[PDB]
Design a binder for this molecule. Structure first.
Ligand SMILES: *[C@@H]1O[C@H](CO)[C@@H](O[C@@H]2O[C@H](CO)[C@@H](O[C@@H]3O[C@H](CO)[C@@H](O)[C@H](O)[C@@H]3O)[C@H](O)[C@H]2NC(C)=O)[C@H](O)[C@H]1NC(C)=O
Ligand SMILES: CC(=O)N[C@@H]1[C@@H](O)[C@H](O)[C@@H](CO)O[C@H]1O
Ligand SMILES: *[C@H]1O[C@H](CO)[C@@H](O)[C@H](O)[C@H]1NC(C)=O
Lengths: 1239, 97
């Protein structure tokens, strides 16, 4: 434990862990209680009324602070029970943050960061800072001064205001010059924020409403990261503020966000800053550390302490990771400085802690907190010691229900925030309305982003989850500076807090006159007061806004006509079922017009709901969006401008041979780096000025749907109240089920709207942002190619030649693919981007797919598709084609007479999947035979197979043959290239090269520039031709042709795209079928049974052996061990196909009799030895397994463990335990294509 | 020493121990050697066929120029070095003592 010996509250005043204390302050302060909790950390159970003199009262100020939410209380912390609970909670939060390894490293970093003793006016002396120590007064009467790092004090006047403060100096800015000082954290554990999250429905479609409470551990972690930044003296200047534009009506009035907050939030927010400012900060901090190292080198004396100067120098060199070269000459190395800076900046982030804790948190700081919740942490029945609010084994663990207020309501109590709902407001008029400040768009200014693109560059000879665990492994421990004796300072420690820059109060009540309706008017037109009078829906905002009793709706006229009708007792159940069904009908509508680029699901009713673009018609909105792209959604167009990129200058070493090649190599490398940097700048600009508006629109849609549901159930309850006693008792009704079903409809509509906004943002990025960069960037490539050309000839030859020009023409004529995988994390965004490119590029030349009981081309170009009589199709999946070595085992494809050119194929590609059986007959050696033909009259291409190799042949009219080959050996213990499903693709640039790719990996390139004219085949042939084997047969599926050359990016994702679990061969795993077993970690062994029963067990033995035939193949035996069978437990699918997340039972065949697999989870140890039992077993033992990995679950739903093996003594037994491997397995169905003989 | 020429052993299960023999041009078809001892016995030009070897223990025996087809060598000590210039066909080699 990090916190031993819990200190209660009424323990005595011994003096080393509990004592009375003098804090530094400007004036006089009385003795104050606190409890030492660890080395160099203290916690003070009192309100912060001593550090700042201006805050002498706890009354809410007349001028409320510009904060989204805030609560005030003056009797809190007053009594001793509150002090005890406060201290218990803060201790629990410290131990919880210490529990996680990342938090453990952060706590160690906090401990080690003792401030520098640079307070001596004389340069060569070390003196402690007077303002970074605490005077501990002993019961005897005297006091001792002691240094420390952190102080935890109850909140300020504004209770929920958690912050970090430091004690400054007259001339030294400690927090930003590498010295650092003690930090005071104004914090409380008893209160939490309450925010709203609407991006969880992807994981939990059954989620109800939001209103989630942030884990107080995360807030304490944020405070600790602020502290950690301040101890190492690397805090960013507070006056550096991410300024925003505030002139417009739709622009948020104003809010300060310093760059230190952006750094500490990390993750998505950390991308709001460009690389240039980060580089400036890094250089400045490196210079400051060089300065402190120089000062430490200069100093040779110390006054005011007992221990040696050498000991303190050792402590400081460990704190700053400095290096001394055995000569008393300290120096910092760029590598260790970079590592430490990355650890303090990029590793220690709020996002990483949220990911590790598995708790809800707002992904962006824009999602302002909306409530204050009183909580209780001291009891363990409310907040578990390990997993936070999400207690395991309970209903709260699932779906992250612990943080949901509406479920875990007995834990959270809502409080009335003292910031008015409309205290900070803006006025909009056309009929005037008021808007809260925190519900407006966030418009960053252009000044916050800068570029060094214009600056020219010269090149010389030499120019240039897991990572957390590697850093933890590399991290150092056991070195915590011991407590030190110092000469005591005065009775009173004078000192002033670090001065905060002044922020002027932003104006309130501004009036804006507009000639059009803004979306705020529409959003207000749907609210109501839920008075006694009847409320009526309407389709005109002009009346809904004016009349308080009339509420606007964007639904169809029949809906409002129905909801305005009075009905009788017998009719109400039909009325409510009709209205809920109809409501689902409008909420589920999606447009079918998909000719627009990757906006596949256009949702119309967003138009009249929020008045996007100033139309009130669904069809008009659809037309406007189709015409104008995603621009119309944005409230204001974000200006993007890429100035001319600087040129590149190369130095010349007269008569050089190998340094010049280095110069060209470095030129290429810097070209790649420039491309990467400009993509990064474009992405950060997009994320800063595009995503926020989309997020706000999504939030407005969510609240609009909720308001519509509110009005509907309000009018329904109004109608319900009209009845007399007999009707209401005879005819029952409740609102809970209606609320649940309406919320579920809201969620299913919200999934569609969320996805729609996702493609809107991605399409806008791909369409109206990247071309501006790419044009200037390819102009830069043109200039660079010109420079490299001038150097490659230079009208001289004293150089080092066709290879260099080939390389420069190759790389500087093509484009590097653009992906956000290397720029963004938001998983939702990631999927949309890639899925889009591949899905759209699917449409191509031939899309031969077998659906609707026929083999057809979905690319509507193929003329006719001939099917031979001797072809075969797989009953389990009709899309597989099996071809035999017979004449009628043929498939002819009549290629479109349109796309047939003599000199076509300039840039094009093919891709498909092949399964090849295992070669048996020795005559097949060197027996080349064509499998796919598009060659006529000695010109075309052909795919052919031979003994363990695939051959792609291109052939022109003038005899110039070009053969590219991919080979594999048959004499290997484990093969990925025999009887397995293999993705094969061929890319062709008739200008430069032909490339081959297998399952998405690079194999071979050959030049095809010497190729001339390659006339196009009339048709496509699918037939074995020239294969001497009388039994040879193939398997092929998903054949596709691409009219343009492909690239590594579009080919790799394609593999996964075309990729329901699969077997060893890649075919669909099937139920009620036997299967052998194979673990990837240990391939050379097989599974075996022993004395089956509760005492019985499965184990790993071998070797599996070997089956071979001379000079044809050698391979280890595969049909070894007892076969495994899988059958349905609760899957409702009629077919025997298994899919992901299917809970099924597992049985094994032993001497031709079936056994359940099950184990007793109550056995000691995390490892759970499985056993083979008879079918009449006992249901208590866990036997349900979910689905290439498999996980055993308890009968109550608890996961027993991932099925794997453990080396139990000398026996490799099988376990279900909660290793980088051992969770990988493989099923081997009996296959006729392999041919090994069982027995 | 017993010299054997032109044998055709069909569907025979061998259990006992045969010692001090040489076989030439043998055609051992669908045989079965289970739990037996090979002692100073030599095989030359013999054509096996789907024979089964189980718990066979060999001493100074040596296979030469034999065509061994569709056999199983399970729980045996007939290692690789006991085979000289032999062609396997569709055969297998299971766990060996
Ligand atoms: C080694 O083993 C392989 C496969 O285990 C043997 O090849 C197989 O030989 C059989 C017998 O001719 C083929 O069966 C065929 O079945 C069809 C359909 O019923 C029938 O019409 C034919 O008349 C024939 O009986 C089987 O297809 C074939 N398999 C392959 C992959 O070729 C092989 O003969 C064995 N020996 C050698 C030296 O390879
Ligand atoms: C050197 C030797 O003995 N090799 C023979 C080979 O010549 C013969 O063709 C084959 C068929 O029985 O058996 C083996
Ligand atoms: C081998 O089997 C035969 C036939 O069943 C039997 O007579 C003989 O006793 C067995 N071998 C030995 C050495 O017991």
């Amino acid at each position: 434990p990090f916190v031993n010996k819990q200190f209660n509250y009424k323990d005595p005043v011994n003096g080393v862990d509990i004592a009375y204390i003098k804090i530094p302050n400007a004036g006089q302060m009385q003795p104050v209680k606190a409890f030492k909790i660890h080395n160099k950390i203290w916690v003070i159970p009192e309100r912060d009324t001593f550090t700042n003199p201006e805050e002498g009262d706890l009354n809410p100020p007349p001028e409320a602070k510009q904060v989204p939410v805030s609560y005030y209380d003056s009797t809190y912390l007053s009594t001793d029970n509150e002090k005890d609970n406060y201290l218990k909670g803060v201790t629990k939060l410290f131990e919880r943050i210490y529990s996680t390894d990342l938090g453990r490293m952060l706590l160690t970093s906090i401990v080690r960061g003792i401030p520098f003793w640079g307070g001596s006016t004389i340069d060569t002396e070390l003196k402690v800072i007077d303002t970074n120590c605490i005077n501990v007064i002993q019961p005897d009467g005297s006091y001792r001064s002691e240094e420390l790092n952190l102080v935890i004090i109850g909140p300020s006047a504004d209770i929920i205001q958690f912050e970090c403060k430091s004690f400054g100096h007259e001339v030294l800015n400690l927090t930003r010059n590498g010295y650092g000082s003690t930090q005071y954290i104004r914090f409380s554990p008893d209160f939490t924020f309450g925010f709203e999250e609407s991006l969880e429905v992807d994981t939990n479609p059954l989620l109800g409403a939001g209103k989630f409470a942030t884990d107080p551990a995360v807030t304490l972690a944020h405070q600790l990261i602020h502290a950690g930044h301040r101890l190492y003296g690397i805090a960013i200047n507070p006056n550096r503020v991410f300024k925003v534009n505030t002139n417009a009506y739709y622009e948020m009035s104003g809010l300060e966000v310093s760059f230190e907050e952006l750094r500490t939030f990390g993750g998505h927010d950390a991308k709001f800053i460009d690389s240039l400012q980060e580089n400036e900060f890094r250089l400045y901090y490196y210079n400051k550390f060089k300065d402190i190292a120089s000062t430490l080198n200069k100093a040779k004396s110390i006054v005011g302490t007992t221990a040696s100067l050498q000991y303190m120098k050792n402590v400081f060199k460990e704190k700053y990771l400095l290096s001394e070269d055995t000569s008393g000459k300290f120096s910092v190395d760029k590598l260790k400085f970079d590592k430490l800076y990355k650890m303090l900046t990029e590793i220690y982030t709020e996002d990483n802690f949220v990911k590790f804790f598995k708790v809800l948190n707002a992904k962006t700081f824009l999602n302002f907190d909306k409530a204050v919740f009183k909580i209780n942490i001291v009891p363990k029945v409310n907040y578990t010691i390990y997993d936070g609010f999400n207690l395991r084994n309970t209903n709260l663990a699932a779906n992250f229900n612990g943080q949901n207020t509406e479920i875990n309501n007995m834990n959270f109590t809502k409080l009335k925030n003292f910031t008015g709902l409309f205290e900070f407001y803006k006025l909009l008029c056309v009929l005037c309305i008021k808007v809260n400040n925190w519900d407006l768009f966030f418009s960053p200014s252009e000044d916050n982003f800068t570029n060094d693109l214009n600056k020219g560059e010269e090149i010389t000879s030499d120019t240039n989850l897991d990572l957390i665990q590697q850093y933890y492994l590399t991290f150092n421990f056991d070195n915590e500076p011991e407590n030190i004796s110092i000469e005591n300072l005065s009775s009173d420690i004078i000192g002033q807090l670090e001065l905060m820059p002044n922020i002027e109060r932003f104006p309130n009540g501004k009036k804006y006159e507009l000639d059009k309706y803004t979306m705020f008017h529409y959003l207000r037109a749907q609210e109501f007061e839920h008075g006694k009078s009847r409320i009526a829906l309407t389709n005109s905002v002009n009346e809904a806004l004016l009349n308080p009793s009339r509420v606007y709706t964007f639904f169809s006229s029949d809906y409002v006509k129905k909801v305005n009708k009075a009905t009788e007792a017998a009719m109400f159940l039909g009325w409510v079922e009709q209205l809920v069904y109809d409501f689902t009908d409008e909420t589920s509508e999606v447009s079918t017009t998909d000719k627009i680029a990757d906006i596949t699901i256009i949702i119309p009713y967003i138009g009249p709901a929020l008045n996007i673009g100033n139309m009130l018609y669904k069809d008009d909105f659809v037309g406007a969006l189709i015409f104008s792209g995603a621009v119309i959604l944005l409230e204001f167009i974000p200006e993007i401008a890429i100035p001319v990129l600087g040129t590149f200058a190369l130095v010349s070493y007269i008569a050089n041979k190998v340094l010049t090649v280095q110069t060209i190599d470095n030129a290429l490398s810097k070209r790649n780096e420039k491309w990467d940097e400009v993509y990064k700048y474009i992405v950060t600009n997009w994320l800063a000025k595009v995503n926020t508006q989309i997020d706000l629109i999504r939030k407005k849609m969510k609240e609009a749907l909720e308001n519509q549901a509110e009005a509907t159930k309000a009018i329904i309850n109004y109608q319900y109240n009209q009845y007399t006693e007999e009707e209401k008792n005879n005819i029952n009704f409740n609102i809970d089920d209606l609320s649940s079903k309406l919320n579920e409809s809201i969620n299913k509509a919200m999934i569609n709207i969320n996805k729609f906004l996702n493609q809107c943002s991605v399409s806008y990025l791909m369409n109206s942002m990247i071309p501006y960069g790419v044009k200037r960037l390819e102009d830069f490539d043109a200039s660079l190619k010109d420079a490299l050309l001038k150097y490659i000839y230079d009208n001289r030859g004293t150089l080092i030649v066709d290879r260099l020009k080939d390389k420069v023409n190759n790389t500087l004529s093509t484009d590097i693919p653009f992906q956000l995988s290397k720029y963004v994390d938001n998983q939702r965004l990631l999927s949309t981007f890639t899925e889009y490119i591949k899905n759209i590029i699917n449409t191509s030349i031939l899309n031969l797919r077998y659906e609707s009981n026929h083999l057809i081309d979905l690319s509507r170009y193929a003329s006719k598709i001939n099917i031979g009589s001797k072809v075969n199709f797989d009953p389990i999946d009709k899309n597989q084609i099996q071809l035999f070595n017979l004449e009628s085992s043929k498939i002819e494809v009549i290629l479109k007479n349109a796309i047939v050119y003599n000199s076509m194929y300039e840039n094009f590609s093919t891709s498909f999947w092949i399964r090849i059986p295992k070669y048996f007959n020795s005559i097949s050696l060197n027996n080349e035979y064509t499998i796919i033909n598009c060659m006529e009259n000695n010109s075309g291409w052909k795919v052919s197979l031979n003994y363990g190799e695939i051959i792609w042949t291109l052939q022109d009219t003038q005899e110039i043959k070009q053969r590219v080959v991919f080979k594999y050996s048959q004499m290997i213990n484990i093969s990925d290239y025999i009887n397995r499903w293999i993705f094969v693709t061929i890319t062709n640039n008739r200008l430069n090269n032909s490339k081959i790719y297998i399952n998405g990996r690079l194999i071979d390139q050959k030049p095809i520039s010497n190729l001339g004219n390659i006339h196009a085949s009339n048709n496509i042939m699918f037939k074995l031709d020239g294969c001497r084997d009388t039994h040879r047969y193939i398997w092929i599926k998903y054949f596709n042709l691409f009219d343009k050359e492909l690239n590594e990016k579009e080919i790799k994702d394609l593999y996964d795209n075309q990729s329901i679990l699969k077997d060893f061969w890649g075919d669909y795993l099937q139920y009620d079928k036997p299967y052998y077993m194979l673990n990837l970690y240990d391939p050379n062994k097989y599974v075996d049974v022993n004395n089956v029963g509760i005492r019985g067990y499965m184990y790993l033995k071998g070797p599996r052996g070997s089956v071979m035939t001379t000079n044809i193949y050698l391979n280890s035996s595969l049909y070894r061990g007892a076969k495994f069978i899988i059958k349905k437990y609760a899957s409702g699918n009629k077919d025997n196909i298994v899919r992901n997340n299917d809970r099924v039972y597992i049985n094994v065949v032993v001497k031709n009799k079936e056994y359940r697999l099950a184990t007793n989870a109550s056995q000691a140890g995390v490892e759970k030895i499985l056993s083979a039992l008879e079918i009449p077993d006992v249901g208590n033992l866990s036997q349900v397994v979910v689905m290439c990995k498999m996980n055993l679950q308890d009968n109550n739903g608890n996961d027993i463990g991932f099925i794997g093996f453990h080396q139990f003594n000398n026996i490799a037994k099988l376990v279900a335990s909660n290793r980088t491997l051992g969770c990988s397995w493989e099923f081997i169905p009996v296959d006729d294509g392999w041919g090994e003989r069982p027995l | 020493m017993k010299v054997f020429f032109g044998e055709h052993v069909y569907g025979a299960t061998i259990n006992f121990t045969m010692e001090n023999q040489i076989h030439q041009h043998g055609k051992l078809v669908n045989d079965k050697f289970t739990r037996m001892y090979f002692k100073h016995v030599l095989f030359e030009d013999t054509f096996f066929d789907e024979c089964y070897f189980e718990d066979v223990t060999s001493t100074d025996t040596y296979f030469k120029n034999c065509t061994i087809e569709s056999t199983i060598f399970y729980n045996t000590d007939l290692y690789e070095h006991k085979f000289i210039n032999c062609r396997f066909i569709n055969s297998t080699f299971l766990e060996q003592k």
